[PDB]
């Protein structure tokens, strides 16, 4: 039962990057006592672990050990502190050390790293790891002073081989009792043992567990070329996410935007590198982000000529709204990498853009408060979590396969569906981020970050951020929006957005279907009954009607008018009208989908007990004009019920009348712009429409369920 | 609520039912759910006999027969998993679970056809442990068992290094794992156990459509974890076969498991209410079968016959002369003289008497087969463990050998390949057959007629050495050349089978090892009793010493000796 106060952890870390902060928090959670070394001076060694370097740390350690060179009651611990997270308690560590009994315990890994020749001169152990790795040791102060005093070399020469050569001596080993944690009872390495680690969750802390020997390590040390797996492990161990306690360090380090001074600046940058659907809506939405428009700059780089008219249309309002504007046309023939590079460079040189919030144009931001939250989270890089609709695609990757391409992780499905909440850590984000300014100034000072490689800009960007030692967060607390599917997009029409009911249903509904439709479906009024067993409810909106009628007119071939038919299988119309069947325009299947989804429920909630499939055969647009043909004679229809929709205003574009119902002596005076008419049309409604006098009127018809 | 599910169970229903009748549980607190269909054989008759014989002692029995039809439409055969079969199994188990929730019953223990629940205290030891889904770890003959240790992406086996230190019982106590199939034990009082569901897959299901990957998902979604623990020995089950075998194959496999029970326990008695359809032993297509045994040794022989009729093999028994008890007056009466300049190759001792008796017994066997003029005969010993499909494979191999025709004299079936090196030459056009080498342990070998005549032409009546050393000389493979020079002619052509078909039951320095030979007195005098060697036994096993680049992959292997599924 050695006293838990005689333990002194010594690390080494020149700068203060984010990994060091992670280690400091993890060690503080258990109340260790960390005393750092070399905080401020320059890294006088070499590459971190590429081939060689790092003999300088032993020199600092020797210089420090003169202070404790006499003490006998203290147990010292040395762990390299850039990629280590402490997974356990001090008392357990001391107990395991004492039970080991020895005086100096090293960490054992499965590879002889610097040199190969002395593989055989080590002892023989049947089961556990064999060789030595100088990444971290624990022992008495006196032995460590005796063991570090013998260092006299260049400040650049390698470190680990010196410890190896020293330990290899038999007499020295027996004199000072140097042992290896063959079975990984205290030190665990994540190189060559990446198939024996499982996360053992617990009530309010997490902990790893080496299955092959069933021990619970203390110092996970993700050495070598496995910093990605350690980054993944950094979300949980030791208090990051606990199955009852929400998150861990996930709500602190918040500025709360104080001072009263206008909030810090921004340099927005919208990129449109594809032909993307619903572009004008996104452009209009850009005018609503909750940030005073006297600070947010802008930069809108198009790259496709087809999108020129929309930006040309919407330019002046953006010019007025924001404190500055700049465009780049499609004629510069700029590669996407060059464009992103230019944006980043333009924020790097200005000493004022405190942030940089890029945003691709394939990202619909439902929430209007994203910028405030992202600025508030106060981290070096961060994204929102946009997810495709009803699927698993999203903008991040659980893990990297050895090919540096996507390889699924074990908690990606449990992140996409928001069963866990926090600010995670991830090895690739894209399509929205908030890069802090100083990180762009004095921690990534080169220019070519996106381009400079055959690889696509996104992967090269994320690699160039991973390599420098900067985490790529991803915050998925609230609902931040949804992506758009632009995989296939037929742009050879008048208004291509109409054919978009099979790929982006939700935005289609938000834009085309009338705004009051949900209220009428839920049943809080609006739905009218001017005459018995006829229904008058709102379906379509102004945009859809205008664009549909414009497309129909652009088609032109207003066939029909003959009592005999070529379009009908029988070839004999009971009552000809000047019409165009939807089968001609290609709008057949989309209209069938509209009937199947947005109309069926309305009838199944209005005529109780009826179940419909919304199968249709006849559906058309008819044009009424006082010149060519007047209204229709009384008749009946070969369907269970019919759908009647008006397509333009009454009085502003035509003076006429609606429909008249004979058996009730019922008149329909004024059709509204977007609503619809529902009535049985087989037996009990002998109906006939009044004619029109001035202007022109179009109506929609569909004979559902023949 | 013991809930069987039988199909083509006629070969094994007696033994499993007998071992399921004796579960130490007051039989007024139990039930049954036998529900069988789609069976070629007469499973219906035997099950009805048993259930009607026992419908009194239990609490409340059930039944659901569907004898018609007699096969699935879109199936290849009796062992193919067509999706209709998966659907039917899922629905039937779901109906069983639903029937065990309306009777207000704690626990539901899902035995299956072949899972021989040997230990009587299985139910008590699972019940007294208080976990929601626990499932004892049944042994087998190979790696196969009834718990995984990790599913990769779509629910297929991924071995995790914490498997072997469980299946070999190097750790104990219940271990959280993500898969248990066959024999488990649900609970039905705990609150969370109202969401387990067999058939209707959980709406978030993405993986394949098996019948044990639709359960693990359900138990993961409802926050109950499947345990497995192995504090003692529980049962046995046979390894699943490929999807293209016949019903006789399954019968043989379960016979093999029954045989495996006998190595260290009394046999698995059949029940008393139903009777076993005794089979007709056959003579293997041979001339003779022999078995050396000692009159004093009574335990070994009984097990050996039990094994022999278990594979419908008759036996012509012979008596082995006690070399230990014999004295010089009759030892020299036959001119028995030890070979000049012979010692123990490993210890240095000259000779022993148990080996003398074994040599005399083999000599008499050779003389008898020579006198009667048999074409081919089979020899055994008193400690065996028969491998899978022993009779059929030996029959097919010898049929091939005889049809081809060659100078086979001392074909081997079990030995120890001490000369661990690069592989041996394979005899052309013959499968599973390789040329001989230096090897001890003449446990089982088929002595031919011409080979017997040559060996008797040797006259080894002036030279006594152990037969495991005597045989390699006669076909010119002994390393020491002085022994070869002491002999004259080397006309024997020994062969051997590369899938070895007979292993020793007990190894050296192991339990149940009492060597009749080795530990005895020297051929002369009567006061040198060489004790059984513990340290320098040097005959541990040629299986962990052979795990090197021995290869022998150039051989042609049978369509049989291929089995197993996702597990190995």
């Amino acid at each position: 039962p050695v006293n838990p106060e005689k333990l002194l952890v010594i690390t080494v870390a020149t700068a203060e990057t984010e990994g060091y902060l992670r280690f400091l928090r993890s060690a503080e959670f258990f109340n260790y006592t960390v005393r750092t070394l070399g905080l401020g001076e320059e890294w006088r060694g070499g590459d971190v672990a590429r081939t060689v370097g790092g003999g300088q740390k032993v020199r600092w350690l020797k210089k420090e050990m003169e202070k404790y060179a006499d003490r006998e009651d203290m147990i010292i611990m040395f762990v390299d502190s850039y990629d280590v997270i402490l997974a356990g308690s001090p008392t357990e560590l001391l107990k395991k050390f004492v039970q080991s009994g020895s005086r100096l315990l090293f960490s054992a890994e499965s590879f002889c790293w610097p040199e190969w020749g002395l593989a055989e001169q080590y002892p023989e152990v049947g089961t556990g790891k064999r060789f030595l790795n100088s990444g971290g040791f624990i022992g008495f102060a006196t032995t460590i002073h005796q063991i570090v005093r013998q260092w006299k070399y260049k400040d650049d020469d390698d470190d680990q081989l010196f410890y190896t050569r020293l330990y290899l001596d038999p007499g020295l080993r027996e004199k000072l009792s140097l042992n290896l944690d063959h079975k990984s009872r205290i030190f665990q390495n994540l190189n060559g043992a990446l198939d024996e680690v499982v996360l053992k969750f617990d009530r309010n802390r997490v902990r790893i567990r080496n299955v092959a020997y069933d021990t619970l390590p203390i110092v996970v040390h993700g050495n070598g070329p496995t910093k990605l797996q350690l980054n993944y492990l950094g979300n949980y161990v030791p208090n990051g996410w606990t199955p009852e306690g929400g998150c861990g360090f996930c709500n602190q380090d918040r500025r709360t935007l104080p001072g009263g001074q206008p909030p810090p600046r921004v340099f927005l940058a919208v990129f449109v590198e594809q032909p993307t659907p619903f572009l004008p809506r996104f452009l209009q939405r850009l005018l609503l982000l909750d940030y005073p428009p006297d600070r947010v700059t802008l930069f809108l780089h198009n790259n496709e000529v087809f999108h020129e008219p929309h930006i040309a249309d919407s330019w002046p309002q953006l010019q007025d709204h924001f404190s500055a504007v700049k465009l780049v046309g499609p004629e510069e023939a700029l590669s996407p990498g060059e464009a992103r590079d230019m944006a980043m460079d333009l924020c790097r040189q200005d000493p004022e853009c405190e942030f940089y919030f890029s945003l691709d144009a394939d990202a619909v931001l439902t929430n209007l408060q994203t910028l405030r939250i992202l600025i508030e989270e106060n981290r070096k890089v961060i994204a929102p979590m946009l997810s495709r609709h009803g699927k698993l695609w999203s903008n991040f990757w659980g893990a990297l396969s050895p090919d540096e391409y996507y390889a699924r992780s074990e908690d990606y499905v449990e992140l996409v569906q928001r069963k866990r909440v926090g600010v995670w850590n991830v090895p690739y984000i894209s399509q929205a981020y908030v890069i802090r300014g100083d990180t762009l100034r004095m921690e990534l000072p080169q220019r070519d970050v996106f381009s400079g490689s055959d690889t696509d800009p996104d992967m090269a960007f994320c690699k160039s951020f991973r390599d420098k030692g900067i985490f790529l967060h991803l915050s998925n607390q609230h609902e931040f929006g949804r992506l758009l599917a632009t995989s296939r997009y037929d742009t050879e029409h008048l208004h291509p957005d109409l054919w978009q009911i099979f790929d982006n249903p939700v935005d289609w509904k938000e834009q085309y279907i009338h705004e009051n439709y949900s209220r009428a479906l839920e049943g809080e009024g609006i739905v009218e009954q001017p005459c018995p067993d006829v229904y008058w409810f709102p379906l379509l909106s102004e945009q859809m009607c205008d664009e549909l009628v414009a497309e129909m007119e652009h088609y032109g071939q207003w066939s029909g008018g003959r009592h005999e038919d070529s379009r009908l299988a029988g070839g004999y119309e009971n009552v000809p009208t000047v019409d165009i069947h939807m089968k001609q325009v290609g709008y057949e299947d989309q209209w069938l989908q509209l009937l199947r989804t947005y109309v069926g429920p309305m009838t199944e909630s209005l005529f109780p007990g009826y179940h419909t499939k919304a199968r249709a055969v006849m559906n058309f647009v008819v044009r009424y004009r006082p010149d060519e043909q007047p209204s229709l004679r009384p008749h009946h229809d070969s369907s269970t019920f019919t759908l009647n929709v008006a397509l333009n205003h009454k009085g502003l574009d035509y003076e006429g009348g609606g429909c008249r119902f004979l058996r009730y002596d019922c008149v329909i005076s004024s059709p509204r712009k977007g609503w619809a008419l529902l009535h049985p049309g087989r037996l009990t409604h002998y109906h006939e429409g009044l004619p029109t006098t001035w202007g022109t009127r179009y109506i929609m018809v569909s004979f559902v369920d023949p | 609520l013991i809930a069987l599910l039988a199909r083509n169970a006629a070969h094994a229903l007696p033994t499993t039912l007998g071992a399921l009748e004796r579960l130490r549980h007051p039989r007024e607190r139990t039930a049954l759910w036998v529900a069988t269909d789609h069976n070629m054989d007469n499973t219906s008759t035997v099950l009805r006999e048993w259930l009607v014989a026992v419908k009194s002692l239990y609490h409340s029995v059930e039944w659901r027969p569907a004898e018609e039809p007699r096969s699935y439409p879109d199936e290849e055969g009796p062992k193919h998993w067509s999706d209709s079969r998966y659907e039917h199994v899922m629905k039937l188990r779901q109906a069983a679970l639903k029937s065990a929730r309306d009777m207000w019953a704690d626990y539901i223990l899902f035995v299956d056809a072949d899972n021989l629940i040997l230990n009587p205290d299985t139910l008590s030891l699972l019940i007294a442990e208080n976990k929601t889904v626990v499932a004892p770890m049944l042994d087998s003959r190979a790696a196969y068992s009834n718990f995984w240790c990790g599913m990769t992406s779509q629910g297929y086996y991924k071995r995790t290094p914490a498997y072997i230190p469980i299946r070999k019982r190097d750790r104990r106590g219940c271990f959280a794992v993500p898969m248990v199939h066959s024999t488990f034990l649900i609970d039905l009082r705990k609150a969370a156990s109202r969401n387990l569901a067999f058939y209707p897959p959980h709406p978030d299901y993405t993986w394949s459509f098996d019948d044990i990957i639709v359960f693990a998902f359900s138990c993961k979604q409802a926050e109950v974890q499947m345990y497995v623990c192995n504090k003692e020995e529980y049962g046995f089950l046979p390894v699943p076969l490929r999807a293209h075998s016949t019903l006789q194959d399954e019968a043989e496999s379960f016979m093999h498991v029954q045989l495996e029970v006998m190595v260290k326990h009394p046999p698995a008695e059949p029940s008393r209410f139903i009777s076993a359809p005794t089979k007709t032993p056959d003579k293997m297509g041979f001339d003779e079968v022999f078995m050396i045994n000692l009159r004093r040794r009574q335990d070994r022989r009984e097990r050996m016959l039990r094994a022999l009729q278990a594979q419908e093999i008759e036996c012509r028994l012979v008596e082995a002369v006690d070399g230990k008890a014999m004295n010089t007056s009759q030892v020299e009466a036959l001119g028995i003289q030890m070979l000049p300049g012979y010692r123990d190759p490993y210890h240095g001792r000259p000779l022993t008497k148990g080996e003398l008796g074994c040599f005399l017994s083999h000599y008499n066997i050779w003389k008898e087969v020579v006198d009667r003029g048999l074409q081919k005969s089979l020899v055994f010993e008193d400690d065996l463990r028969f491998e899978i499909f022993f009779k059929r494979r030996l029959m097919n191999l010898m049929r091939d050998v005889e049809r081809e025709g060659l100078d086979w004299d001392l074909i081997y079936v079990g030995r120890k390949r001490m000369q661990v090196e690069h592989p041996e030459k394979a005899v052309p056009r013959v499968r599973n057959l390789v040329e001989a080498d230096y090897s001890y342990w003449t446990l089982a070998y088929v002595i031919s007629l011409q080979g017997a005549r040559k060996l008797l032409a040797a006259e080894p009546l002036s030279k006594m050495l152990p037969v495991d050393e005597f045989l390699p000389v006669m076909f010119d493979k002994h390393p020491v050349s002085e022994y070869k020079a002491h002999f004259s002619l080397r006309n024997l052509h020994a062969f051997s089978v590369e899938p070895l078909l007979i292993y020793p039951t007990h190894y050296t320095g192991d339990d149940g090892y009492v060597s009749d030979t080795e530990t005895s007195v020297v051929w002369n005098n009567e006061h040198v009793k060489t004790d059984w060697d513990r340290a320098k036994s040097q005959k541990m096993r040629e299986q962990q010493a052979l795990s090197r680049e021995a290869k022998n992959s150039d051989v042609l292997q049978s369509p049989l000796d291929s089995a197993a599924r996702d597990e190995l």
């Binding site: 969750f201 617990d202 199955p243 992780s409 | 990769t152 992406s153 705990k190 974890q225």
Partner: peptide
């Protein structure tokens, strides 16, 4: 496809006795 879990699942309370 790495780092499999050992999720924390406790023992749920017993259901109330029948009557």
């Amino acid at each position: 496809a790495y780092f499999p879990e050992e999720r924390w699942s406790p023992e749920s309370p017993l259901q109330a006795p029948r009557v």
